[PDB]
Coordinates of C-alpha atoms in Angstrom, one line a residue:
Chain A
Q1 CA 5.7 80.3 67.7
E2 CA 4.9 83.5 65.9
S3 CA 8.5 83.6 64.4
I4 CA 8.2 79.9 63.3
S5 CA 4.8 80.7 61.7
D6 CA 6.4 83.7 59.8
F7 CA 9.2 81.4 58.6
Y8 CA 6.7 78.8 57.4
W9 CA 4.7 81.5 55.6
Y10 CA 7.9 82.8 53.8
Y11 CA 9.0 79.3 52.8
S12 CA 5.6 77.9 51.8
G13 CA 6.0 79.2 48.2
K14 CA 9.4 77.6 47.7
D15 CA 9.3 74.0 46.4
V16 CA 12.4 72.8 48.3
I17 CA 13.8 74.2 51.5
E18 CA 17.4 75.2 51.2
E19 CA 20.2 74.3 53.6
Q20 CA 20.1 77.6 55.5
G21 CA 16.4 77.3 56.1
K22 CA 16.8 73.8 57.3
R23 CA 19.5 74.8 59.8
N24 CA 17.3 77.7 61.0
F25 CA 14.3 75.4 61.4
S26 CA 16.4 72.9 63.4
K27 CA 17.7 75.6 65.7
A28 CA 14.2 77.1 66.3
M29 CA 12.7 73.6 66.9
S30 CA 15.4 72.7 69.3
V31 CA 14.8 75.9 71.3
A32 CA 11.1 75.1 71.3
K33 CA 11.7 71.6 72.5
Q34 CA 13.7 72.9 75.5
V35 CA 10.9 75.4 76.3
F36 CA 8.3 72.6 76.1
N37 CA 10.4 70.4 78.4
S38 CA 10.6 73.3 80.9
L39 CA 6.9 73.8 80.7
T40 CA 6.3 70.1 81.3
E41 CA 8.7 70.3 84.3
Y42 CA 6.6 73.1 85.9
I43 CA 3.5 71.0 85.9
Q44 CA 4.8 67.4 86.0
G45 CA 4.1 67.1 89.7
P46 CA 0.4 67.7 90.5
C47 CA 0.9 71.4 91.3
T48 CA -2.6 72.8 91.2
Chain B
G1 CA 17.6 123.7 30.9
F2 CA 20.0 121.5 28.9
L3 CA 21.0 123.1 25.6
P4 CA 21.4 126.7 27.0
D5 CA 23.9 125.4 29.6
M6 CA 25.9 123.7 26.9
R7 CA 25.9 126.9 24.9
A8 CA 27.0 128.8 28.0
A9 CA 29.9 126.3 28.5
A10 CA 30.8 126.6 24.8
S11 CA 31.0 130.4 25.3
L12 CA 33.1 129.9 28.4
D13 CA 35.4 127.7 26.4
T14 CA 37.5 130.8 25.4
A15 CA 41.0 130.9 26.8
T16 CA 40.3 134.1 28.7
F17 CA 37.8 132.3 31.0
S18 CA 39.0 128.7 30.5
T19 CA 40.6 128.5 34.0
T20 CA 37.6 130.0 35.8
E21 CA 36.1 128.0 38.7
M22 CA 32.6 128.3 37.2
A23 CA 33.9 127.0 33.9
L24 CA 35.4 123.9 35.6
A25 CA 32.2 123.4 37.5
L26 CA 30.2 123.6 34.3
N27 CA 32.5 121.1 32.6
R28 CA 32.2 118.7 35.6
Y29 CA 28.4 119.0 35.5
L30 CA 28.3 118.4 31.7
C31 CA 30.6 115.4 31.9
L32 CA 28.4 113.7 34.5
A33 CA 24.7 112.7 34.6
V34 CA 23.6 114.8 31.6
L35 CA 25.9 113.8 28.7
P36 CA 25.6 110.1 29.5
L37 CA 21.9 110.7 29.7
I38 CA 22.0 111.9 26.1
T39 CA 24.1 108.8 25.2
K40 CA 21.5 106.5 26.8
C41 CA 18.6 108.2 24.9
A42 CA 20.5 108.3 21.6
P43 CA 18.3 105.6 19.9
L44 CA 15.2 107.7 20.9
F45 CA 16.5 110.5 18.5
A46 CA 15.3 108.7 15.4
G47 CA 12.7 110.6 13.5
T48 CA 13.6 114.0 15.0
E49 CA 12.7 116.0 11.9
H50 CA 10.1 118.2 13.8
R51 CA 12.9 119.6 15.9
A52 CA 15.7 119.3 13.3
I53 CA 16.4 123.1 13.4
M54 CA 17.4 122.7 17.1
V55 CA 19.0 119.3 16.6
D56 CA 21.7 120.6 14.4
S57 CA 22.3 123.4 16.9
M58 CA 22.8 121.0 19.7
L59 CA 25.1 118.9 17.6
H60 CA 27.1 122.1 16.9
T61 CA 27.8 122.8 20.6
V62 CA 28.6 119.1 21.2
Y63 CA 31.3 119.3 18.6
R64 CA 32.6 122.5 20.2
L65 CA 32.6 120.8 23.6
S66 CA 34.6 117.9 22.1
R67 CA 37.2 120.3 20.6
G68 CA 37.5 122.6 23.6
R69 CA 40.5 123.1 25.8
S70 CA 41.0 122.7 29.6
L71 CA 39.2 119.3 29.4
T72 CA 40.3 116.1 31.1
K73 CA 41.0 113.0 29.0
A74 CA 38.0 111.2 30.6
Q75 CA 35.7 114.2 29.8
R76 CA 36.9 114.4 26.2
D77 CA 36.3 110.7 25.8
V78 CA 32.8 111.1 27.2
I79 CA 32.0 113.9 24.8
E80 CA 33.4 112.0 21.8
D81 CA 31.5 108.8 22.8
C82 CA 28.3 110.9 23.1
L83 CA 28.9 112.4 19.6
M84 CA 29.4 109.0 18.0
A85 CA 26.4 107.5 19.7
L86 CA 24.2 110.4 18.8
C87 CA 25.4 110.4 15.1
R88 CA 24.7 106.7 15.0
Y89 CA 21.0 107.2 15.1
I90 CA 20.6 110.5 13.3
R91 CA 19.2 110.6 9.7
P92 CA 22.0 111.4 7.3
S93 CA 20.2 114.3 5.7
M94 CA 20.4 116.1 9.0
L95 CA 24.2 115.8 9.4
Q96 CA 25.4 117.8 6.4
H97 CA 26.1 120.7 8.7
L98 CA 28.3 118.4 10.9
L99 CA 30.6 117.4 8.0
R100 CA 30.6 120.9 6.5
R101 CA 32.0 122.0 9.9
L102 CA 34.4 119.0 10.1
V103 CA 36.0 119.8 6.8
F104 CA 37.4 122.9 8.6
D105 CA 40.0 120.6 10.4
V106 CA 39.6 117.0 9.2
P107 CA 41.6 117.6 6.0
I108 CA 44.4 119.2 8.2
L109 CA 45.1 115.8 9.9
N110 CA 46.0 117.7 13.1
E111 CA 46.1 116.1 16.6
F112 CA 42.3 116.8 17.1
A113 CA 41.5 115.3 13.7
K114 CA 41.7 111.6 14.5
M115 CA 38.2 111.6 16.1
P116 CA 36.4 113.5 13.3
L117 CA 37.3 111.3 10.4
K118 CA 36.6 108.2 12.5
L119 CA 33.1 109.7 12.8
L120 CA 33.1 110.1 9.0
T121 CA 33.8 106.5 8.0
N122 CA 31.4 105.0 10.6
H123 CA 28.8 107.3 9.1
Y124 CA 29.7 106.6 5.4
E125 CA 29.9 102.8 5.9
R126 CA 26.4 103.0 7.6
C127 CA 24.9 105.3 4.9
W128 CA 26.7 103.9 1.8
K129 CA 23.4 103.3 0.0
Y130 CA 22.5 107.0 0.5
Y131 CA 25.1 108.1 -2.1
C132 CA 26.4 105.2 -4.2
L133 CA 23.1 103.7 -5.2
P134 CA 21.0 106.0 -7.5
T135 CA 18.0 105.3 -5.3
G136 CA 18.3 106.8 -1.8
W137 CA 19.0 104.9 1.4
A138 CA 16.2 103.0 3.0
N139 CA 13.4 105.4 4.2
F140 CA 15.5 108.3 3.0
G141 CA 15.6 110.2 -0.3
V142 CA 18.3 110.8 -2.8
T143 CA 21.4 112.6 -1.5
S144 CA 21.7 116.3 -2.4
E145 CA 24.4 117.3 -4.9
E146 CA 25.8 119.7 -2.3
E147 CA 26.6 116.6 -0.1
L148 CA 28.2 114.9 -3.1
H149 CA 30.5 117.9 -3.8
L150 CA 31.2 118.2 -0.1
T151 CA 32.3 114.6 0.2
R152 CA 34.3 114.8 -3.0
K153 CA 36.2 117.8 -1.6
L154 CA 36.7 116.0 1.7
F155 CA 38.1 112.9 -0.1
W156 CA 40.5 115.0 -2.2
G157 CA 41.6 117.0 0.9
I158 CA 42.4 113.9 2.9
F159 CA 44.1 112.3 -0.1
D160 CA 46.5 115.2 -0.9
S161 CA 47.1 116.1 2.8
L162 CA 48.2 112.5 3.4
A163 CA 50.2 112.7 0.2
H164 CA 52.2 115.8 1.3
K165 CA 52.6 114.7 4.9
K166 CA 55.3 112.6 6.7
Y167 CA 54.5 109.0 7.5
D168 CA 52.8 108.3 10.9
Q169 CA 51.8 104.7 11.6
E170 CA 48.9 105.5 13.9
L171 CA 47.5 108.4 11.8
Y172 CA 48.0 106.4 8.5
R173 CA 46.1 103.3 9.7
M174 CA 43.4 105.5 11.3
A175 CA 42.8 107.6 8.2
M176 CA 43.0 104.8 5.6
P177 CA 39.5 103.4 6.6
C178 CA 38.0 106.8 6.2
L179 CA 39.5 107.2 2.7
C180 CA 38.2 103.7 1.7
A181 CA 34.7 104.5 3.1
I182 CA 34.5 107.8 1.3
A183 CA 35.7 106.2 -2.0
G184 CA 33.2 103.4 -1.7
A185 CA 30.3 105.7 -0.8
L186 CA 30.6 108.3 -3.5
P187 CA 29.5 107.0 -6.9
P188 CA 32.3 106.6 -9.5
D189 CA 30.5 108.6 -12.2
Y190 CA 29.7 111.7 -10.1
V191 CA 30.1 115.0 -12.0
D192 CA 30.3 118.3 -10.1
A193 CA 29.2 121.6 -11.6
Chain C
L1 CA 21.9 113.5 54.4
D2 CA 25.4 112.7 53.2
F3 CA 25.8 109.9 55.7
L4 CA 22.4 108.5 54.7
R5 CA 23.2 108.5 51.0
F6 CA 26.6 107.0 51.8
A7 CA 24.8 104.1 53.6
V8 CA 22.2 103.7 50.9
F9 CA 24.4 103.9 47.8
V10 CA 27.4 101.5 47.5
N11 CA 29.5 100.6 44.4
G12 CA 27.2 102.5 42.0
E13 CA 24.1 100.6 43.1
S14 CA 21.4 100.9 45.6
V15 CA 20.8 98.5 48.5
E16 CA 17.1 97.9 48.5
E17 CA 16.8 97.0 52.2
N18 CA 18.6 100.1 53.4
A19 CA 16.7 102.3 50.9
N20 CA 13.3 100.9 52.0
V21 CA 14.1 101.4 55.7
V22 CA 15.4 105.0 55.0
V23 CA 12.4 106.0 53.0
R24 CA 10.1 104.5 55.6
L25 CA 11.7 106.5 58.3
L26 CA 11.6 109.7 56.1
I27 CA 7.9 109.4 55.2
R28 CA 7.2 108.5 58.9
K29 CA 8.7 111.9 59.9
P30 CA 7.7 114.5 57.3
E31 CA 9.4 117.3 59.2
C32 CA 12.7 116.0 57.8
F33 CA 11.7 117.6 54.5
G34 CA 11.8 121.1 55.9
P35 CA 9.4 124.0 54.9
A36 CA 9.2 122.7 51.4
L37 CA 7.7 119.3 50.4
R38 CA 5.5 119.8 53.5
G39 CA 1.8 119.2 53.6
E40 CA 1.2 122.0 56.1
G41 CA 3.8 124.3 54.4
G42 CA 3.3 123.6 50.7
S43 CA 6.1 126.0 49.7
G44 CA 7.2 124.1 46.6
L45 CA 10.6 123.4 45.2
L46 CA 10.7 126.4 42.7
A47 CA 9.4 128.8 45.3
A48 CA 11.9 127.6 47.9
Chain D
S1 CA -33.8 96.5 50.7
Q2 CA -31.0 97.3 48.3
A3 CA -33.4 98.2 45.5
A4 CA -35.3 100.5 47.8
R5 CA -32.0 102.2 48.9
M6 CA -31.0 102.8 45.3
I7 CA -34.5 104.0 44.4
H8 CA -34.3 106.6 47.2
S9 CA -30.8 107.8 46.2
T10 CA -31.6 107.9 42.5
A11 CA -34.8 109.8 43.1
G12 CA -33.0 112.4 45.2
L13 CA -30.2 112.9 42.7
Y14 CA -32.6 113.1 39.7
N15 CA -34.9 115.5 41.6
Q16 CA -31.8 117.7 42.2
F17 CA -30.9 117.5 38.5
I18 CA -34.4 118.4 37.4
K19 CA -34.5 121.4 39.8
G20 CA -31.1 122.5 38.5
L21 CA -32.3 122.3 34.9
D22 CA -35.5 124.2 35.7
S23 CA -33.5 126.9 37.6
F24 CA -32.1 128.5 34.4
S25 CA -34.9 127.7 32.0
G26 CA -36.1 130.7 30.0
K27 CA -33.1 132.9 30.8
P28 CA -29.9 132.9 28.6
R29 CA -26.7 132.5 30.4
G30 CA -25.0 135.5 28.7
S31 CA -21.6 136.2 30.2
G32 CA -21.7 134.8 33.7
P33 CA -23.1 131.4 34.6
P34 CA -26.5 130.9 36.1
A35 CA -26.8 131.7 39.8
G36 CA -27.9 128.2 40.6
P37 CA -25.5 125.6 41.9
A38 CA -23.4 123.6 39.4
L39 CA -25.3 120.6 37.9
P40 CA -24.1 117.2 39.3
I41 CA -23.3 115.9 35.8
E42 CA -20.6 113.5 37.0
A43 CA -22.8 112.0 39.7
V44 CA -25.7 111.7 37.2
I45 CA -23.5 110.0 34.6
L46 CA -22.1 107.6 37.2
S47 CA -25.5 106.7 38.5
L48 CA -26.8 106.2 35.0
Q49 CA -23.9 103.8 34.2
Chain E
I1 CA -23.2 96.8 66.2
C2 CA -24.7 93.4 65.4
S3 CA -22.3 91.4 67.7
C4 CA -25.1 90.7 70.2
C5 CA -27.6 89.8 67.4
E6 CA -29.6 86.6 67.6
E7 CA -31.4 84.7 64.9
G8 CA -35.2 84.6 64.8
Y9 CA -35.6 87.8 66.8
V10 CA -36.2 91.3 65.7
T11 CA -33.2 93.7 65.9
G12 CA -32.5 97.3 65.0
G13 CA -31.3 98.5 61.6
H14 CA -33.7 96.1 59.9
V15 CA -36.1 96.7 57.0
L16 CA -39.5 94.9 57.4
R17 CA -43.2 95.1 56.9
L18 CA -45.9 95.6 59.6
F19 CA -48.7 93.1 58.7
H20 CA -52.0 93.1 60.5
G21 CA -53.6 90.1 62.2
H22 CA -55.4 88.8 59.2
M23 CA -52.1 89.3 57.2
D24 CA -53.9 90.6 54.1
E25 CA -52.7 94.2 54.7
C26 CA -49.8 96.1 56.1
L27 CA -48.7 99.6 57.0
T28 CA -48.1 101.4 53.6
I29 CA -47.4 104.9 52.5
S30 CA -49.5 106.6 49.8
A31 CA -48.9 105.8 46.2
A32 CA -46.3 107.6 44.1
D33 CA -47.3 111.1 42.9
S34 CA -50.2 111.4 45.4
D35 CA -52.4 114.4 46.4
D36 CA -51.1 114.3 50.0
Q37 CA -47.5 114.1 48.7
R38 CA -46.9 110.9 50.7
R39 CA -47.6 112.1 54.2
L40 CA -50.3 109.7 55.5
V41 CA -50.1 105.9 56.1
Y42 CA -52.8 103.4 55.3
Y43 CA -53.5 99.7 55.7
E44 CA -53.9 99.2 52.0
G45 CA -52.8 95.7 51.5
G46 CA -53.0 93.5 48.3
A47 CA -50.5 94.1 45.6
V48 CA -48.7 96.6 47.8
Chain F
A1 CA 21.3 116.8 49.1
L2 CA 17.8 115.7 50.0
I3 CA 16.9 115.3 46.3
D4 CA 20.1 113.3 45.6
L5 CA 19.3 111.0 48.6
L6 CA 15.8 110.4 47.3
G7 CA 17.2 109.8 43.8
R8 CA 19.7 107.2 44.9
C9 CA 17.1 105.4 47.0
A10 CA 15.2 104.5 43.8
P11 CA 14.9 100.8 43.0
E12 CA 16.9 99.1 40.3
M13 CA 15.5 98.9 36.7
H14 CA 15.7 95.1 36.8
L15 CA 13.5 95.0 39.8
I16 CA 11.0 97.3 38.0
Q17 CA 10.8 95.0 35.0
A18 CA 10.6 92.0 37.4
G19 CA 7.3 93.5 38.7
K20 CA 8.2 93.4 42.4
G21 CA 5.4 94.9 44.5
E22 CA 7.9 96.6 46.9
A23 CA 9.8 98.2 44.1
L24 CA 6.7 99.6 42.4
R25 CA 5.4 100.9 45.8
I26 CA 8.8 102.6 46.5
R27 CA 8.8 104.2 43.0
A28 CA 5.2 105.4 43.4
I29 CA 6.1 106.9 46.8
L30 CA 9.1 108.7 45.2
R31 CA 6.8 110.0 42.4
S32 CA 4.3 111.2 45.0
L33 CA 7.0 113.0 47.0
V34 CA 8.1 115.4 44.2
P35 CA 6.5 116.1 40.8
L36 CA 8.1 116.3 37.3
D37 CA 7.1 119.9 36.8
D38 CA 9.2 121.1 39.7
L39 CA 12.2 119.1 38.3
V40 CA 12.0 120.6 34.8
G41 CA 11.3 124.1 36.1
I42 CA 14.3 124.1 38.5
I43 CA 16.5 122.6 35.8
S44 CA 15.4 125.5 33.5
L45 CA 16.6 128.1 36.0
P46 CA 19.8 129.8 34.6
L47 CA 23.1 130.5 36.3
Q48 CA 25.4 133.5 36.9
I49 CA 27.8 133.3 34.0
Chain G
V1 CA -13.2 92.3 77.7
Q2 CA -14.9 91.3 74.4
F3 CA -12.5 91.0 71.5
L4 CA -13.1 91.9 67.8
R5 CA -13.6 88.9 65.5
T6 CA -13.9 88.5 61.7
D7 CA -17.3 88.3 59.9
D8 CA -19.3 90.8 61.8
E9 CA -20.8 94.2 61.4
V10 CA -18.8 97.1 62.7
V11 CA -18.8 100.9 62.4
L12 CA -15.7 103.1 62.3
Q13 CA -16.1 106.2 64.5
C14 CA -13.7 109.1 65.0
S15 CA -13.7 111.9 67.6
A16 CA -13.3 115.6 66.8
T17 CA -13.3 118.7 69.0
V18 CA -14.4 122.0 67.6
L19 CA -15.2 125.2 69.6
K20 CA -14.7 123.2 72.8
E21 CA -17.4 120.8 71.7
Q22 CA -16.9 117.0 71.2
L23 CA -18.4 115.7 68.0
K24 CA -18.4 111.9 67.1
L25 CA -18.6 111.1 63.4
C26 CA -18.5 107.9 61.5
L27 CA -17.2 107.0 58.0
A28 CA -20.0 106.4 55.4
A29 CA -20.1 105.9 51.7
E30 CA -22.9 105.5 49.2
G31 CA -21.2 103.2 46.7
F32 CA -23.8 103.7 43.9
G33 CA -23.0 106.7 41.8
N34 CA -20.4 108.0 44.3
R35 CA -17.4 106.1 45.6
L36 CA -15.9 108.8 47.9
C37 CA -16.5 108.5 51.6
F38 CA -17.5 111.2 54.2
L39 CA -17.9 111.7 57.9
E40 CA -21.5 111.7 58.9
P41 CA -22.1 113.0 62.4
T42 CA -23.6 110.5 64.8
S43 CA -24.0 113.1 67.6
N44 CA -27.1 115.2 68.3
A45 CA -29.3 112.2 67.4
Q46 CA -32.1 113.6 69.6
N47 CA -32.7 116.7 67.4
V48 CA -31.9 115.0 64.1
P49 CA -31.5 111.2 63.5
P50 CA -28.5 110.2 61.4
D51 CA -28.6 108.1 58.3
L52 CA -26.9 104.9 59.6
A53 CA -28.0 102.7 56.6
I54 CA -24.7 103.4 54.8
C55 CA -22.4 103.3 57.8
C56 CA -22.2 99.6 58.5
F57 CA -19.0 97.6 57.4
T58 CA -18.0 94.0 57.7
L59 CA -14.7 92.5 58.6
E60 CA -14.5 90.1 55.6
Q61 CA -11.0 88.7 56.3
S62 CA -8.0 89.2 58.6
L63 CA -4.6 87.9 57.7
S64 CA -1.0 88.2 58.6
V65 CA 1.4 90.4 56.7
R66 CA 3.5 87.5 55.2
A67 CA 0.3 85.5 54.5
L68 CA -1.2 88.5 52.7
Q69 CA 2.0 88.9 50.6
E70 CA 1.9 85.2 49.7
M71 CA -1.9 85.4 48.8
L72 CA -1.2 88.4 46.7
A73 CA 1.6 86.6 44.9
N74 CA -0.7 83.6 44.3
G75 CA -14.3 80.7 61.8
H76 CA -14.4 84.0 63.7
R77 CA -10.6 84.6 63.8
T78 CA -9.6 87.1 66.5
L79 CA -8.1 90.4 65.3
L80 CA -4.7 91.6 66.8
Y81 CA -2.4 94.4 66.1
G82 CA -0.1 94.0 63.1
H83 CA -2.6 92.1 61.0
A84 CA -4.1 93.3 57.7
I85 CA -7.9 93.4 57.4
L86 CA -10.4 93.7 54.5
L87 CA -13.5 96.0 54.9
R88 CA -16.6 95.6 52.8
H89 CA -19.5 98.0 52.6
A90 CA -22.8 96.4 53.8
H91 CA -25.1 98.1 51.2
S92 CA -23.1 98.3 48.0
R93 CA -21.1 95.2 48.7
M94 CA -17.9 97.0 47.6
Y95 CA -14.6 96.9 49.5
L96 CA -13.1 100.0 51.1
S97 CA -9.8 100.9 49.6
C98 CA -7.4 103.8 49.1
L99 CA -7.7 105.3 45.6
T100 CA -5.0 107.0 43.7
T101 CA -7.0 110.3 43.1
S102 CA -5.6 113.2 45.1
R103 CA -8.6 115.6 45.3
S104 CA -7.2 117.7 48.2
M105 CA -5.0 120.7 47.7
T106 CA -3.9 121.7 51.2
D107 CA -1.9 118.4 51.6
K108 CA -0.4 117.4 48.3
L109 CA 0.7 114.0 49.7
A110 CA -2.9 113.0 50.6
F111 CA -4.9 110.5 48.6
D112 CA -8.6 109.6 48.8
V113 CA -10.5 106.7 50.3
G114 CA -13.5 105.1 48.6
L115 CA -15.3 101.9 47.6
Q116 CA -14.1 99.6 44.8
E117 CA -16.0 96.7 43.2
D118 CA -13.2 94.0 43.4
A119 CA -11.1 92.8 46.3
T120 CA -8.0 92.3 44.0
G121 CA -4.9 94.3 44.8
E122 CA -3.2 95.6 48.0
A123 CA -5.1 98.9 48.1
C124 CA -8.1 97.4 49.9
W125 CA -6.1 95.9 52.8
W126 CA -5.5 97.9 56.0
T127 CA -3.0 97.2 58.8
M128 CA -4.0 97.9 62.4
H129 CA -1.6 99.4 65.0
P130 CA -2.0 100.1 68.7
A131 CA -2.7 103.8 69.3
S132 CA -1.8 103.6 73.1
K133 CA 1.4 102.4 74.8
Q134 CA -0.5 99.9 76.9

């Protein structure tokens, strides 16, 4: 999340995100999606 | 820190010490990071009357460093380029010593005489209003009569030397622009005492 | 020092990233400057 | 509160300046400077501005 | 310092006036350039 | 060697005219490391002809 | 386990040891007629009370490094290491900053710290780093 926030802060000034930035964002968001799915799996069952 | 070292190298230019390791080191140091620095700061030399006494002196040694021996082709080209770039922005009334020194060898049309007369025409084409027009060049006064006699003698020396020498294509079409520039610059009705 | 200047300077130009990193490390460790250019020492270039 | 704080600081600084001025009054400096401490002319100028 | 400060209650590092019960006077030092050289406190009140 | 290394670590002129904050900071640091007086004095030192 | 937060009063205190005696001093500046700061000793308060009226500072704003760079190009938030902060004097309402005047002679590479009227520029922002390994 900190890395993604830094990337957003860097790219905020630019008007249009370039192709490389879009690819990096897609990779980071896919990794974050997998981590979120694992976190959901850890607590999907009512594990107190 | 700059001029004294050039003077020391010019003293070291003699054939007795020309092959010395220190002489080669001094030549290498002069060719790099100091002479190109002078080339870069050449336009800043405009209006250098206050230090004119030293300026001529430095010009002097520069010319010597361009005519010295034991110099690589690249080093000689660097010194010649520095001389031309410097003389580009120097007021013409300051350079009379330069041409009075050049007339030592420029009317000889030797191997080392191609660069000097090239420096002549480029100057005389730039400062043609200094001599031809009765009013002096812009921001400058009227040319001294000594300069007029000097350039007349230079023109006649080049003319008769080229008259009495064998034909050389490169030398001929290098020296012809200089003769044309000198003829154009010096007024037609000049009379020398 | 020769290796550092080889890394910093390439093809007659200076790489800003490498130069900034090198200068950051150098200022972070003043003892790299020796007895001279030292706050505690203060010898001076001409004196040295 | 701010006005009182600047009043206190200004009063102290100007009292120091007045004492410094009165230290060498009536005695020419001559060769060496007066034995009193150097007048805080920079602080006085900055405070006045 | 003021992390545990609460509104409406007196705290340290505060400048304030000590008014009496009738509120017409308060603890004041002597006037400027006084005989006692500002060493005694009085319940003057009024314009002070 | 140290002086040469610090010299070639200087930022480019185009960055200086661009007004980049990092380039100005680096140039200020380099100017703070050594002064001009030392440079001119050491250049003025003669050699063993 | 309380954590520092923005928009609150705070005092910067150092710790020196001279003649096997521990002295605690705090940074303080006047701000009116004198910009330079100095260490006033907060120790030995029983014998002599210190002047703490010019020792209070306020954490005006904390920001990230890249956010600070972007804002320079253009809620009690918790403070964490690696974040720039802005310090403002409580009395003079002038921000602490690193001036370009080098008044020391022992260390030639040492600048001065003082109060400045405006918050513009990068000289008034200070980055925090963890002193300990923990």
